[PDB]
Design a protein around this ligand. Structure first.
Ligand SMILES: OC[C@H]1O[C@@H](O[C@H]2[C@H](O)[C@H](O)[C@H](O[C@H]3[C@H](O)[C@H](O)[C@@H](O)O[C@@H]3CO)O[C@@H]2CO)[C@@H](O)[C@@H](O)[C@@H]1O
Ligand SMILES: OC[C@H]1O[C@@H](O[C@H]2[C@H](O)[C@H](O)[C@H](O[C@H]3[C@H](O)[C@H](O)[C@@H](O)O[C@@H]3CO)O[C@@H]2CO)[C@@H](O)[C@@H](O)[C@@H]1O
Lengths: 327, 314
């Protein structure tokens, strides 16, 4: 498996990702609606060639070992096979992205256990066994459906120090899934994962504020060059809200306070600094819902979604531009 | 260092409870355990396990006047005092999970923010400990996921030493005696002795080796067990089998703990858990499921242990 700028041929240079995330948060009833097919078709007008099929699994608290998946209201295996096949039927390559959320609302980056096993607390080994059942379930589904890529986790910051357990999980994933593996580290954490060598492609969440993108391009370029792996953004986006570009990751910032231009300016700056560099492999944007609002409602919508908003035209002109289209 | 024969008083630290007529009577009754120490214990609060701001000395938490009262009352009863300010989390998360990213990032609160807030809380009470002549200050309790922040703990302890001239301890959690790298920075090692029935001989051997490796005094800053069905298997679990009364279970826990931990010269005794500011009636004791031993057989085990000549010689 071990490889540098190019994943070994048996797992596929690496594609340049022109992507949009579809289906979050992963609600069976939404994915089985008529609306879901129309949503995914409309998403193709972004001139994407990839989609990340994203959906939640659940644990009760940040310190509980048991992860539930594929039970109401979460997506069924049939819902997931449908989304993958529909995406492929539209000419998209697929990243399967199972994401653990915490029922009590805690940000998943805080999921954590004591360093030292004690008789009175759940252990890292218990949580990793549950997380392995979750991720291997979907790794097997990714193999059966021919997903080009699997993302084995997303911003699991307080688990990343568990290097032996992550490398053990990745070895188990390799036994059931033959495609490309990535892990999506959180914003600002590109240099903090000690096991990047164990995946094929490095990726992070590009929620960097307006005015910071030139700085982050220099920072990330040096990290990627130190690892000699391909790198892309597994998430990047910004809500269409007042001052959201200062905190593009904060999905609770200024709800209902619409600013289309703020989202537009975020995208223009991100693409100004991250474009066609040979070490960079593009963008999986965030995000596009299974049930898409009416075009007539777009100018009053405060979501990350770009549908009907000026940012969609920045994305389309970037993805159809010769410099990007040739990558 | 004294041999501690102690009971914790006042938890969770509710101003209304501490100002009740009942509080004085509760503390007087506690002296019948033949204790010579009490830990005056009370909460501060932060919203979540990952929020940096600690609130204290605001309703419903104890006023500074309430804390001066409890310290002076205890001393008026001939007791030495450990002051024990404890941070809790409003959302109910066990404080051992309080934690921040190792690496400062612009999008999250930082260790330095939380430690500044924790410093404000602990230095407030260190100054009150000094002003009131508390013999000892406990600078934290089972803060497991902070203990790796060694520089910040040592920095806090330096600030506490500038304002408080008494004995400092830190109370590590059950099973964590060998896991604190900065024991040297406090005067006395302490832990939470919530070891299950059948395990005390094992833990005496484990802890003896840890304490002799450090060459510092050690005692249990907490130890106890609810009077509940099968509580002795998980003495620390305050939610285990609520309302399912078993006096003998609590009694057996105490007899075993004292069988194995007694007069060893490396060992400096027990701060037991715990005794409320508002004490239940004696006639309600046989239906009470709390850690409190008042009116229960375990109280007689404690009294006979604390008044025994081998423990009286220490
Ligand atoms: O879909 C309804 C569901 O929304 C829940 O909040 C979500 C937000 O709406 C965003 O979709 C948010 O996106 C973040 C993801 O968690 C990414 O993995 C992360 O890296 O950044 C993006 C952008 O902020 O996700 C949350 C869920 O995690 C929530 O409000 C829920 O109650 C509601 O039903
Ligand atoms: O006093 C009412 C208050 O109780 C809260 O629960 C407490 C329990 O009743 C116990 O007193 C428990 O004691 C633990 C302490 O946290 C020690 O520091 C720890 O080391 O172990 C002991 C023994 O288990 O403390 C909790 C509070 O932390 C809670 O139910 C609250 O809602 C209620 O108002």
């Amino acid at each position: 498996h071990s490889s540098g700028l190019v994943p070994r041929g048996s797992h596929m240079s690496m594609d340049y990702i022109k992507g949009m995330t579809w289906g979050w948060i992963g609600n069976s009833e939404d994915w089985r609606s008529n609306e879901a097919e129309r949503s995914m078709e409309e998403m193709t007008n972004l001139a994407i060639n990839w989609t990340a099929i994203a959906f939640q699994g659940l644990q009760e608290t940040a310190h509980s070992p048991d992860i539930t998946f594929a039970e109401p209201p979460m997506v069924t295996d049939e819902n997931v096979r449908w989304a993958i096949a529909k995406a492929k039927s539209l000419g998209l390559s697929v990243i399967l992205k199972p994401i653990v959320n915490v029922r009590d609302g805690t940000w998943r980056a805080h999921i954590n256990f004591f360093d030292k096993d004690v008789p009175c607390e759940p252990t890292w080994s218990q949580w990793f066994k549950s997380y392995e059942s979750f991720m291997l379930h979907y790794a097997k589904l990714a193999e059966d459906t021919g997903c080009e890529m699997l993302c084995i986790g997303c911003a699991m910051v307080q688990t990343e120090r568990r290097e032996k357990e992550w490398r053990d999980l990745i070895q188990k994933v390799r036994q059931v899934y033959s495609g490309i593996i990535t892990y999506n580290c959180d914003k600002y954490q590109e240099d903090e994962v000690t096991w990047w060598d164990a995946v094929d492609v490095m990726s992070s969440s590009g929620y960097y504020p307006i005015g910071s993108w030139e700085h982050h391009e220099s920072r990330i370029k040096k990290i990627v060059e130190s690892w000699q792996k391909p790198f892309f953004f597994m998430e990047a986006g910004c809500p269409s809200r007042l001052e959201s570009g200062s905190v593009p990751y904060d999905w609770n910032k200024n709800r209902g306070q619409i600013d289309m231009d703020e989202q537009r300016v975020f995208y223009e700056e991100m693409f100004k600094f991250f474009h066609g560099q040979k070490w960079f492999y593009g963008f999986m944007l965030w995000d596009w819902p299974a049930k898409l609002y009416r075009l007539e409602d777009a100018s009053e919508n405060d979501d990350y979604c770009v549908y009907g908003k000026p940012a969609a035209e920045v994305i389309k002109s970037f993805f159809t531009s010769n410099k990007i289209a040739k990558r």
